[PDB]
Amino acid sequence: KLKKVLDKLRLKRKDISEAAETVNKVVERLLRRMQKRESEFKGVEQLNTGSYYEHVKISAPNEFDVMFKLEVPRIELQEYYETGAFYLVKFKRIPRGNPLSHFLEGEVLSATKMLSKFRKIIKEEVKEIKDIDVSVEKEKPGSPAVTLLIRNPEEISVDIILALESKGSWPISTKEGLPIQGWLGTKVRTNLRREPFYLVPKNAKDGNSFQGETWRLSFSHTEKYILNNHGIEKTCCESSGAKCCRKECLKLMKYLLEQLKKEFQELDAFCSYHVKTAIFHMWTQDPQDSQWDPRNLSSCFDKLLAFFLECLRTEKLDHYFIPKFNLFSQELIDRKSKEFLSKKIEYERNNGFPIFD
């Protein structure tokens, strides 16, 4: 039933091999340039994130997320209002001439300036690539990335995400977040929150004050770890352990939403991170690996489905790391959208999921 859908969604190792070849080449060139010519993004490091690197990419390997993170010492964050997600970045110490002085709009590190220079460098190096059909995509509003289109005959999109790495303790807005204590445990959560955190440009085009100096938190590293260490049992999905159907449900849900989005313009507010967040909450709700046995696929997928609908009905999907940040607020998504989606989803749920063809 659903197993056949999962077969359809499976990536093919040939496609994977070629796409990965080309992609790795381009990425390596860009990183190296970002170090080489006496840049100010020298010292940047690489961190692969997203569905492809979590092995939850569906249909095709045509989307890649790569973080160019740069450690930026001695900073102080001023929370942008009480959003929990958004911050203004200040420095204690302008070191001397300082790489990042040119990226200052006061005491405040400007996300848009930094992003513009980043973009300029990337375009420059991309012009010098003669053996691969790679180009720079026009800037998308609300993106912290420079998106590359690769004609590896087939089209592949690569988000090169500019990030700031901070080894300090996580902002307060996350203190109640990451509620894995009953699922992955206390030692795990403690070790994860000991890790650095990351800030990417918000790059909203709304016309606000502090619009180009607003940064958003990112936890793609931690999400990667969770996707790859997802059981209560350490042997879950391991070589000497047993498979769950967690990743599978994430894939099915992702696909459902992708299709429902390609057919309806009413769902342009929705992205797969909503699905991911919701499923994090579900995995925290049903921690037991037994509650995610393959033989219970259909029911498991329904459980999640049910949960999601409730999130729409209550208009309440809390951010998994920032509990005060609601993702289904009226400010971000209109009621009408959520209701429309509840309708379509319910239909599909009561009709044997016709859309899966």
Binding residues: 49, 51, 63, 65, 142, 159, 202, 216-223, 230, 236-237, 244, 254, 272-276
Q: Take residue 2 and report the two structure tokens written for it.
A: 């659903």
- Options 78, 98, 235, 290; binder of its own copies; rule CB under 8 A: 235
Tokens 């319910």 sit on residue: 346
For residue 227, what are the CA distances in angstroms to 52, 169, 176, 279? 11, 23, 20, 11
Core vs surface per residue 272-295: b (16+ CB within 10 A) or e:
bebbbbbbbbbbbebbebebbeee
- Return the sign of the alpha-carbon dihedral for residues 204, 205, 211, 213: positive
Contact range with Zn ion by CB under 5 A, out of 8-16, 172-180, 242-250, 313-321: 242-250
DSSP label of 238 = S
Nearer to its own copies, 112 or 284 (CB): 284
By CB under 8 A, tell whether 239 contacts its own copies: yes
By CB under 8 A, tell whether 175 contacts its own copies: no
Contact positions with its own copies (CB under 8 A) in 179-198: 181-188
- For residue 89, the cross-strand partners are 77
Half-sphere exposure of residue 341, counting CA atoms within 13 Å on the CB side?
A: 31
Residue type, 308: F
Contact range with DNA by CB under 7 A, out of 112-120, 130-138, 241-249, 342-350: 241-249
Q: Where are any strands of DSSP class E within 26-153?
A: 45-49, 63-71, 75-79, 86-91, 134-136, 145-152
Please report, in range form, the residues annotated as the binding site for ATP. Answer: 51, 223, 254, 272-276
By CB under 7 A, tell whether 130 contacts DNA: no
Tokens 């190792």 sit on residue: 13
Please report, in range form, the residues annotated as the binding site for Mg(2+). Answer: 63, 65, 159
| Nearest-5° Cα angle at 245, 282 to 223 | 55
Residue 99 binds: one of Zn ion, DNA, its own copies, none (C-beta under 5 to 8 A by kind): none
- Options 2, 11, 60, 269; binder of DNA; rule CB under 7 A: 11
Please report how close the Cβ of residue 240 comes to its own copies at its closest, in angstroms: 4
Distance CA 316, CA 327 (A): 7
Nearer to DNA, 24 or 78 (CB): 24
Contact positions with DNA (CB under 7 A) in 38-57: 48, 53, 55
Instruction: Enumerate binding residues for DNA (CB under 7 A).
Output: 10-14, 16-17, 20-21, 24, 32, 48, 53, 55, 95-96, 167-169, 175, 186-187, 189-190, 193-194, 196, 228, 237-239, 242-243, 247
Given the rule CB under 5 A, which residues bind Zn ion? 231, 236-237, 244
